[PDB]
C-alpha cells in the first residue's frame, strides 16, 4: 500500500484563464447535445427491458465515435429483486485504465419502472437522462483535449444501471448497479499486480450527477472531504458569470450555494462513500417538482440551466486534470 | 401484481369549495373532542398497564358509537424487551376492509414509562394523547360522510402500541406495535385472494400524527413521495385562513412551511417507510418544549392550535376520499 | 448645562427575582382589562367626534380612580388639516411632574376616519385601542407599587390624539397630537426654573405602543440608542417563559427577536426621535393583517398574546424604575 | 366630497378560473412583443433627443392601432435641469376618461444620458424599455376584452419622461415627468366639474413597472396599503405555475416573495405616494446586475421571465377590472 | 432496577452568581494551557505509535499532578483493522468510582494517520489536541473545588483512542476506542454488586468535545434528550459576555446558536447514544476549514476562542456538579 492513494488529498487544480474559459464555453453545444445525445434516451428503459439495451447502445455509440481511446466495458450481472432475478448492466468507459488514479463522473441510465398511465410512459428526463447526456456531451466537447493523455491521473465515466427501486425503495431494492460495482472495484488490485491497493484507492473523486435539468437548481455541499472541490465549482460558476458566459443567470440564483446539508440522500454514491471514496454529489435539493411523475419529460427541462452546468462541469473537469 | 398498486401515484383530490370549507369548519367542536375524546386518555398508560387497557377500551368505545361501519381489530402480540417479554395491543379500525386502497391515519396510544417523581406522573398529552383524540374527533365529525362508503378507496385508523422505548431509545427497544404491524401486513395478501400484492401495496398514504398540541408548531416536508400531499396541507391552511376559519393564527406563524428537513426522525412510520409506503409525517420540528417531561400535560396545550388542525386534517381527508 | 440630562445613558434596571416575577404575572387580569379598560374604547373615535370625548373621558375616569397621584393634563389645541382647523386633545397623566426625569409610555387614542361601509364602522382594536388599555391596566396593577413615589425619576403616560391621517398620509396630515406636544415640550423648561433644559431632556425613554393585539406579533430593534432596553424586553420574555408564566407561548414564537430593522415607520415617536429622545418603538413588523380594515376588531384579537405582553411590559417598567 | 374615492379600499378582484387563465396565457406573445413592441425602443432616447420623439411616436402608433377607444395625450412641459430649461413629454393613454376611477399602469420611457463610450450607447433595456413593451403588449393582448368598456373604473397607462437624473440623482434632478403630472393631476378636479376631488382621488392604484427584464427578479412588498394586491400577484403566480402555464419557473425562485423591504426606493411613484395614491411598485430588489451600465441591453434580457411576468400582469388587470 | 438511574432526568444546575462567574474566568489561564497542556500534544500520535505513548503518558502526568483524587485507568485492548490486529489504550480518569452518577466529558487523543507530505506531518490541533487540553486545563483550573467530593454524583474524563479511521471511514474502521468502552460499560455492573444497572446507567450526560479550536465555531443542538443543557451552554455564554468576561466576542457570532440539525455526525458518542446515554456533542458545524489537512496546526488555532470556550465549559461543569 504505497503512498499514491493519498495524492488525491493534495491534488490541486490548474485554474484556467479568461481566454481558455471563453474557449470552453464556446466549445459546447446544448443543441447537439439535445438532439444527438439526449433525445435518443428519452424512452422507457428499466432493467432488462429493450429500452435498457437501446439506451445502453446509444451511449456506447456516442463514446465509440470519439477520438480519445475510451475503453468501454459492460458489467452485466445478476441480482435478486422483488420480482425475481433480473439482469443489469453497468457501462464503464475508461481512459488509461492503467492510470493509477482516476477522476470519475457517474450517473445512472436506468429509468424507474412504472406502468403506463393514460398511455404515457415514464422516461426520466431529469432522472437521469440529462445527466447521461451531460456526460456524453462532455466527452464530445473535451475530446481533443482528452487525447493528451496518450501526475498519473485520468478520467472515467460510469453509467450505472438499476439505480432505481423496482417496487418499494429500500436497501434491498435500490442501487443495484453500484456496489455491485463498488464491491467489485473494492476487490480488484490497482494498478494491476498491485497487492494491497484496490481500484477504489485509485478513485480520486467521484462526481455523481443526478436529478439535473429542472430550473433553479441548488446543489448543496454534502461532504467535508470534497468541500474544496465544491468550492471550485462555486468559483467556476462565479467566473463564468462575471465573464458573461452564462445564460439567463444571476448570482442571486446561483446553483452552488454554500449551505451545508443535514441528512443524506441515498443515491449511487453510498456504496463508494462508505468505502472512503470522496464524493461530489451533484443532486439538487429540493428535487425537481416533476420528480417521479410522468411530467419528468422534456417539455419541462431548462436548456439554459443545462448549458450552464455543462460549461461549469467541463471547466471543473479540465482544471482537475491539469488540462 | 396488477396495476392497482400504482393507482395511488396519480390520485388527485376533490378540492372543496368555500361553502364546503365553512361547513366543515362549523362541523368540529374542540370542546367536545376535548372532554369526550381526549380527557379520558390523560392517564399513565404504558404497556401492560391498566390505563393501557382502559385507554384501548375507551378508544374503542368512541368508535363503536358511530354510524360508519368501523371494523375494529385488536392485535395483541408479544415481543422481547429490556424488561423481558411483554404483551402489546394495537388497535386498527377499518372502513370497507375489502377496499383495496386505504388512506391511513395513525398515531400511538402508549405513553412512556417513567417512575413517579415528586408525586407527578407522565401522561404524554402531546405524545400522543392529542393525536389520538384528533383522530377520534375526525371519525366523529365526518361520520355522516364516511357513511357514503356503504375509485375503490376508504379510510383506516391505527393506534399503535409500544411506540416508546421502555428503557433507552434504540432499534431493538422502540416501535413495538408498528414494526410488527408492518411485517404482518407486508405478509398478508390484499385484497383477499391475491397472489402478488400485500395490504401494504394498499396503503396509499400513512398520515402519522405525533407530538402535536403545543403552541407554534412547524411541520416540515420530510419526504418527496408525499410532498404533494404536504403542499395540500399548506394550501388548505392558507385557504382556511383567508376565509377566517382559523383562530389566533397568522400566515406569519403558519404550521406547514416549505422547509425540507435534513435527515430523519425515527417514529412509527419507519417500519412502513422502508417497505415502500408513502408517509406524511405530521411531527413537528422542533419537538414541543415539554417533550418527555412531566410538564407535558393539559395545562400546556394550545386548544386553539388543535381546533385549527382538526379543521385542516378533516378537510384533507375529505378531499383525499372525494367526499 | 448640568449633567442630569445624561443620567439616562447610564441608568440600569433593578431586575426581578423569580418570586417577584410571579407576583407581577399573578397581578394583572386580562379579563378585567378586556371589559373594564378595553371594551369602552372599541368605538369610532376620530377627532372631534363624540367618541373622541367618551374615550377621553373614559381614559381619565379609569386613571382618576387609582390611588397613586396621577396628575392629568388635557392639551386641547387647534391644528390645520385638509378639511380645515380642528380641535384635538392629547391626554397626559404624570407622576411627580417635578421629577426631573420620566420614563414615558404612549399610544394614540384616536381611530382613523373611514365612512361607514355596509354597516361596518372602524374601531381600531389593534390601532390602537389595545395599547390604550394596556396602559390603563399597567397603571392599575402597578398602582400599589407606584405609590412608593410620594434617582429623581417617575412615570408618565401619553395618549395622543390625531395620529392618523384624515385623508391621505403625509407629513402635513398626520401626527397632529405628537407634533404639537413634542414641540411644546421642547420649549417648556424643566424642572420649573430651569434655564437651558426642557421637558424633553427629561424623557428618558419613550416607549410607544402601536398595533398590538394580533396573533404572533414580532417587534424589531429599531434604534441603537435603545437597543439595550430592547435586549431587556427579550430577557423578560425569556425568563417569564422559562418560569411558566406566559400562555400559548414558545421561544420559537418569541415576540422580541433581535433582528434589526432597515428603514423607519412614521409614528408619534418621530416628532420626538427627531429631537433626540430615545425611543423604544413597540410596533410589529409586519403589521397586523387587519390593518386599516373594518376587520380590525375584537373578534380578531388574540387575548393570550396581549396578556403575555402585559406581563412583559409591567416588568420592564418596574425594573426601569426600581420598584 | 362624495363617497366614491373610498371605493378603491373595498374593491375586490374577479378571480379567474383555470380555463380563463389558460386563455390569457395563450393570448400574449412574447415574440410579437419583442419584435414589434420592444426593439424599436432599444435606442438612445433621453429627453430632447431624436430618440425621445421616435420612441414617443412609436408608443402612440402601437396604441393607436388598437380597437379600444384609447385616448392619447402628450403633456408637454418645461422644467429646469442642471443644464437649464429643457422640454419633456409625458404620454398618457386613457380609456373612458370620465371613468371616475382608474387603475393605472405606468413606467418610464426616457433613457439616462451617457456619453458614448468606446463606441457604445446606453439604451436602457430594463430601465425601462421592457416595461414599456410590457404595457404595450398588454394593451394588445387584452384588446378584445378592453373594448367591453365602451363599477365605474377603467384603465390608464402612463409613460413618464425624464425619470432619470441628468447629472447626478437628486430630488432636484430626477422625476421630471412624474413630479409634473403628480401636481397637474392633483389639481385637475375629477370628474369634470367636481369641487373637492382631483384626478388623484380617482387613482385606485398605481402599478409602476421599473427595471424589469433580467433573470431571477424578486419583487418586494413595499407598502402595506397595497399589500392585498401584492398577495394576488403571489396567488396569480402560484396558480399559473400549478397549471403548467409558466416557463422555466420554479416556486423556489418565485418572483413575488412575501419579503417586506426596509427603506424607500426613489422612482416615479414618489410624487404620487406622498400624495396618498396607493402604489404597487413592481421594481426588483436587488437591481439588475447590469443597472446603469452599457451592458443593459437586449442581449442580457431573459425572454422567459418577461413572458412569465406579462402573463401575471395581464391576469392582474383583468381581475381588477372584472373582465 | 432502582430509582437512582432516572435521577439524570431531573437534575437542575446550581447556577452561579455574577461574582463566581468572575472568579472562574479569572482562574483559567489560556497561556498556561497552551504551554503546559496543549503544546505537548502536538505530535504525530496515531494508535500504537510512539507519539501515541508519549501523548498517553503526558495526559496522565497532568492529571497525576493534581490534588483531586483522580483514578487513572488504561483500558488497553486489541482490535482488528485494515492493516491487522493492533493495540489501543483508552484513558479514563474518575473521581469517586463508586459515585453512582457521573458527568462525563470526553474527547479523543489519537491523530489520524497520514503519510508525510512535503516533509509535513499531521498533528491534528483541533482534532482533537485542543479538546484534550481543554479538559486538562479544566481540571487544573477546577482542582480546588473538585476536592470537595472527598447527590451522589462526580466527574469522569475519557480520552478515547482510535476514533479515527486507519484507512477509510466506516463502522468497521473508526471509533475503535468508544465502541469498546461502550460495550464494556454496558457490560459492567455498577455500583459494585448491583444486579440490573451498568456503568452506562450512571453516565448522567456525556459531553463530547471534538473539532474545537477554530475561528467562529457554531455548535448545533443535536439531541432532544440533551437540549436543555444546550440551553444552559447558551445562557452561560450570554451572561459571561454580558459581563465582559469573554474576549473578542459578540453575540452576532455566538458559539451556541439555537439552530437544530438535520442529519447526524459519526463520532465517539455513537456507541453511547444508541445505548441510551444522553449526549451533548460539542462538535461545530461546519467543521474547521482545515479539517483533516496539514494546516490543522497550531498556527491556525484561535486562542481567543478557545479561552472563551474554556470558561463556558468550566462554568457548566460546576453548575452541573453543584460546585
Ligand atoms: C459534516 C457532514 O456533512 N458529514 C457527512 C460525512 C461525514 O464525515 C466524513 C465524511 C467523509 C470522510 C470522513 C468523514 C469523517 C467524519 C469525522 C467525524 C468526526 C471527526 N472527528 C475527527 N475527525 C473526524 C471525522 C472522517 O473521519 N472521515 C459527516
Ligand atoms: C428532497 C430530498 O431532499 N430527499 C432525500 C432522499 C429522498 O428520499 C426518498 C424518500 C421517499 C421515497 C423515495 C426517496 C427516493 C430517493 C431518491 C434519491 C435519489 C434519486 N435519484 C433518482 N431518483 C432518486 C430517488 C426514492 O426513489 N423514493 C428525498
Ligand atoms: C428532531 C431531531 O432532530 N431528532 C434526532 C434525535 C432523535 O430523537 C432522540 C434522541 C435522543 C433520545 C431519544 C430520542 C427519541 C426520539 C423520539 C422520536 C419520536 C417520538 N415520538 C414520541 N416520543 C418520541 C421520541 C426518544 O424517544 N429518545 C430526533
Ligand atoms: C411596510 C412597512 O412596514 N411600512 C411603515 C409605514 C407604512 O406606510 C403607509 C403607507 C401608505 C399609507 C399609509 C401608511 C400608514 C402608516 C401607519 C404607521 C403607523 C400607524 N399606527 C397606526 N396606523 C398607522 C399607520 C398610514 O396610515 N397610511 C410602510
Ligand atoms: C440597490 C437598491 O436596491 N437601492 C435603493 C435606491 C437606490 O438608490 C441610488 C443610490 C445611489 C445612487 C443612485 C441611486 C439611483 C436610483 C435609481 C432609482 C430608480 C431607477 N429607475 C431607473 N433608474 C433608476 C435609478 C440613481 O439613479 N443613482 C439603491
> Widest CA span of chain A, in angstroms?
59
Solved with:
X-ray
Q: Which residues of A300-311 are buried (b: 16+ CB within 10 A; e: fewer)?
A: bbbbbbbbbbbb
D303 within 8 A of D309, measured Cβ to Cβ = no
A106 within 8 A of A159, measured Cβ to Cβ = yes
Q: Do you find a cis peptide bond into B271, omega within 30 degrees of 0?
A: no
**Residue D258 with chain B: CB contacts under 8 Å:** 251
Domain range for B183 is 1-323
**Residue A83 with chain B: CB contacts under 8 Å:** 1
Residue D213 C-beta-side C-alpha neighbours within 13 Å: 26
| Residue keyed to cell 388639516 | C81
Q: How many residues are present in chain C?
A: 323
DSSP reduced 3-state for D195: coil
DSSP secondary structure code for residue D41 in this structure: T
Q: How many residues are present in chain B?
A: 323
In angstroms, what is the span from residue D14 Cα to ligand 4's centroid? 27
Listed in sequence order, the DSSP H helices in chain D are 18-27, 30-32, 50-64, 130-141, 143-146, 176-185, 227-242, 270-273, 303-321
Surface-to-core class of residue B66, CB atoms within 10 Å of its CB (0-12 exposed, 13-18 middle, 19+ buried): middle
**Binary contact (E260, B115; C-beta < 8 A):** no
**Residue C127 with chain D: CB contacts under 8 Å:** none
Q: Sheet holding C101-108: strands in order across? A: C71-79, C86-94, C153-160, C101-108, C203-209, C279-282
| Residue B9 phi, psi dihedral angles, 5° rounding | -70, -15
- A127 labeled binding residue: yes
Report the distance separating Cα C123 and Cα A86, nearest Å: 74
DSSP reduced 3-state for A249: coil
Residues near B72 by beta carbon (within 8 Å), at least 6 away in sequence? B60, B63, B64, B91, B92, B93
Would residue A267 show up in a list of annotated catalytic residues for this protein? Answer: no
Report the distance separating Cα D115 and Cα D35, nearest Å: 27
Report the distance separating Cα D217 and Cα A250, nearest Å: 9
Report the distance separating Cα E46 and Cα E53, nearest Å: 9
> Which residue from C164, C168, C177, C286 has its CB within 8 A of the most atoms of ligand 4, so it is best to mutate?
C164
Nearest CA among A64, A66, A32, A62 for reference residue A144: A66
Report the distance separating Cα B270 and Cα A34, nearest Å: 41
**Residue B258 with chain D: CB contacts under 8 Å:** 251-252
Q: Ligand 2: which residue has its CA nearest to atom 16?
A: A266
A80 membership: H or E segment, kind and range = none
D299 within 8 A of D227, measured Cβ to Cβ = no
Backbone dihedral region for residue E200 (phi beyond 0: left; psi -120 to 50: alpha; all else: beta) = alpha
- B11 labeled binding residue: no
Q: Do you find a cis peptide bond into D84, omega within 30 degrees of 0?
A: no
CA distances from C69 to A107, D240, E263 (A): 81, 64, 61
Partners of residue A189 on adjacent β-strands: A198
Report the distance separating Cα C182 and Cα B68, nearest Å: 69
Which ligand is nearest the CA of E286, by number?
1
Give this entry's resolution in angstroms: 2.8
> Which residue from B163, B211, B287, B289 has its CB within 8 A of the most atoms of ligand 3, so it is best to mutate?
B287
A52 within 8 A of A45, measured Cβ to Cβ = yes
Any ligand 1 atom below 6 A from CB of A225: yes
- How many domains does chain C divide into? 1
A240 membership: H or E segment, kind and range = helix A227-242
Report the distance separating Cα B237 and Cα B231, nearest Å: 10
| Residue keyed to cell 402489546 | B88
CA distances from B10 to A117, A123, A243, B225 (A): 9, 16, 45, 12
Q: Which three cell numbers stand for residue C98?
A: 417635578
Surface-to-core class of residue C67, CB atoms within 10 Å of its CB (0-12 exposed, 13-18 middle, 19+ buried): exposed
> Which residue from E124, E286, E292 has its CB within 8 A of the most atoms of ligand 1, so it is best to mutate?
E292
Nearest CA among D307, D316, D321, D319 for reference residue D137: D307
Report the distance separating Cα D294 and Cα C61, nearest Å: 68
Q: Do you find a cis peptide bond into D60, omega within 30 degrees of 0?
A: no
> Which residues of C are part of the catalytic machinery?
163, 210
Partners of residue D93 on adjacent β-strands: D72, D157
Task: Identify the chains in contact with E, defined as 3+ C-beta pairs within 8 A.
Answer: A, B
Report the distance separating Cα B40 and Cα C53, nearest Å: 53
Nearest CA among B119, B120, B209, B200 for reference residue B160: B209
Q: Which long-range contacts (CB under 8 A, 24 or more apart) does B219-222 make?
A: B219/B255, B219/B256, B219/B257, B219/B281, B219/B282, B219/B283, B219/B284, B219/B285, B220/B257, B220/B259, B220/B260, B220/B261, B220/B285, B221/B256, B221/B258, B221/B259, B221/B260, B221/B261, B222/B260, B222/B261, B222/B264, B222/B265, B222/B279, B222/B281
Contact of chains A and C by CB distance (3 or more pairs under 8 angstroms): no
Instruction: List the beta strands (DSSP E) in chain A.
Output: 71-79, 86-94, 101-108, 153-160, 203-209, 219-221, 256-260, 279-282
Report the distance separating Cα C245 and Cα C23, nearest Å: 10
| Residue keyed to cell 367591453 | D148
Report the distance separating Cα B146 and Cα B95, nearest Å: 8
**In three state form, how does the secondary structure of chain C look?**
CCCCCCHHHCCCCCCCCHHHHHHHHHCCCHHHHHHHHHHHHCCCCCCCCHHHHHHHHHHHHHHHCCCCCCEEEEEEEEECCCCCCEEEEEEEEECCCCCCEEEEEEEECCCCCCCCECCECCCCHHHHHHHHHHHHHHHHHHHHHHHCCCCCEEEEEEEECCCCCCCCCECCECCHHHHHHHHHHHCCECCCCCCCCECCCCEEEEEEECCCCCCCCCEEECCCCCHHHHHHHHHHHHHHHHCCCCCCCCHHHCCEEEEECCCCCCCCCHHHHCCCCCEEEECCCCCCCCCCCCCCCHHHCCHHHHHHHHHHHHHHHHHHHCC
A314 within 8 A of A138, measured Cβ to Cβ = yes
| Residue keyed to cell 429483486 | A81
| Residue keyed to cell 377603467 | D154
CA distance D39 to chain C (A): 38
A interface residues, B as partner, C-beta within 8 Å: 83, 114-115, 117, 165, 167-171, 261-264, 285-287, 291-293
**Binary contact (E292, A224; C-beta < 8 A):** yes
Nearest CA among E68, E55, E64 for reference residue E108: E55
Instruction: List the beta strands (DSSP E) in B112-235.
Output: 153-160, 203-209, 219-221
Backbone dihedral region for residue E49 (phi beyond 0: left; psi -120 to 50: alpha; all else: beta) = beta
Q: How far is CA E16 from the centre of its chain?
A: 22
Annotated catalytic residue, options B163, B237, B268, B319: B163
Which candidate in C81, C168, C218, C290 is best for mutational testing of the D interface (most D CBs within 10 A)? C168
Nearest CA among B301, B223, B215, B289 for reference residue B255: B215
Q: Which three cell numbers stand for residue D54?
A: 421616435
Q: Do you find a cis peptide bond into C116, omega within 30 degrees of 0?
A: no
B306 membership: H or E segment, kind and range = helix B303-320
Q: Which three cell numbers stand for residue A295?
A: 411530467
Listed in sequence order, the DSSP H helices in A95-129 are none
Annotated catalytic residue, options D210, D237, D296, D307: D210
Any ligand 5 atom below 6 A from CB of D227: no
Nearest CA among D224, E39, D7 for reference residue C285: D224
CATH code for the domain of B159: 3.40.630.10
D106 membership: H or E segment, kind and range = strand D101-108
Instruction: Name the residue facing B252 among C249, C252, C286 (closest C-beta).
Output: C286
Any ligand 3 atom below 6 A from CB of E224: yes
| Residue keyed to cell 417648556 | C188
Q: How far is CA E255 from the centre of its chain?
A: 17
Using alpha carbons only, give the angle D129, D134, D137 rounded to the nearest 5 degrees. 125
For A3, other C-beta atoms within 10 Å of its C-beta total 9
A54 membership: H or E segment, kind and range = helix A50-64
In angstroms, what is the span from residue B223 Cα to ligand 2's centroid? 8
Q: Which three cell numbers stand for residue B51?
A: 390505563
Listed in sequence order, the DSSP H helices in B65-196 are 130-141, 143-147, 176-185
Surface-to-core class of residue D151, CB atoms within 10 Å of its CB (0-12 exposed, 13-18 middle, 19+ buried): exposed
C167 within 8 A of D201, measured Cβ to Cβ = no
D254 within 8 A of D242, measured Cβ to Cβ = no
E281 membership: H or E segment, kind and range = strand E279-282
Amino acid at each position: 500500500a504505497s503512498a499514491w492513494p493519498e495524492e488525491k488529498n493534495y491534488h490541486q487544480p490548474a485554474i484556467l484563464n479568461s481566454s481558455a474559459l471563453r474557449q470552453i464555453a464556446e466549445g459546447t453545444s446544448i443543441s447537439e447535445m439535445w438532439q444527438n445525445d439526449l433525445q435518443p434516451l428519452l424512452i422507457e428503459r428499466y432493467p432488462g427491458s429493450p429500452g435498457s439495451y437501446a439506451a445502453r447502445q446509444h451511449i456506447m455509440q456516442r463514446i465509440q465515435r470519439l477520438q480519445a481511446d475510451w475503453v468501454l466495458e459492460i458489467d452485466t450481472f445478476l441480482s435478486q429483486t422483488p420480482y425475481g432475478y433480473r439482469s443489469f448492466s453497468n457501462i464503464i468507459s475508461t481512459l488509461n485504465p492503467t492510470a493509477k488514479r482516476h477522476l470519475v463522473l457517474a450517473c445512472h441510465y436506468d429509468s424507474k419502472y412504472f406502468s403506463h398511465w393514460n398511455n404515457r410512459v415514464f422516461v426520466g428526463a431529469t432522472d437521469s437522462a440529462v445527466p447521461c447526456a451531460m456526460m456524453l456531451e462532455l466527452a464530445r466537447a473535451l475530446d481533443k483535449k482528452l487525447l493528451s493523455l496518450k501526475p498519473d491521473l485520468s478520467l472515467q465515466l460510469i453509467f450505472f444501471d438499476g439505480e432505481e427501486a423496482f417496487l418499494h425503495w429500500s436497501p434491498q431494492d435500490s442501487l443495484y448497479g453500484s456496489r455491485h460495482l463498488a464491491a467489485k472495484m473494492a476487490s480488484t488490485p490497482h494498478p494491476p499486480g498491485a497487492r494491497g491497493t484496490s481500484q477504489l484507492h485509485g478513485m480520486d473523486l467521484l462526481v455523481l450527477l443526478d436529478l439535473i435539468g429542472a430550473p433553479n437548481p441548488t446543489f448543496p455541499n454534502f461532504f467535508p472531504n470534497s468541500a474544496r472541490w465544491f468550492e471550485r465549482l462555486q468559483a467556476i460558476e462565479h467566473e463564468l458569470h462575471e465573464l458573461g458566459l452564462l445564460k439567463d443567470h444571476s448570482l442571486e440564483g446561483r446553483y452552488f450555494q454554500n449551505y451545508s446539508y443535514g441528512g443524506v440522500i441515498q443515491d449511487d454514491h453510498i456504496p463508494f462513500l462508505r468505502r472512503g471514496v470522496p464524493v461530489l454529489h451533484l443532486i439538487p435539493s429540493p428535487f425537481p417538482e416533476v420528480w417521479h411523475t410522468m411530467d419528468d419529460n422534456e417539455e419541462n427541462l431548462d436548456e439554459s440551466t443545462i448549458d450552464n452546468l455543462n460549461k461549469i462541469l467541463q471547466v471543473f473537469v479540465l482544471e482537475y486534470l491539469h488540462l
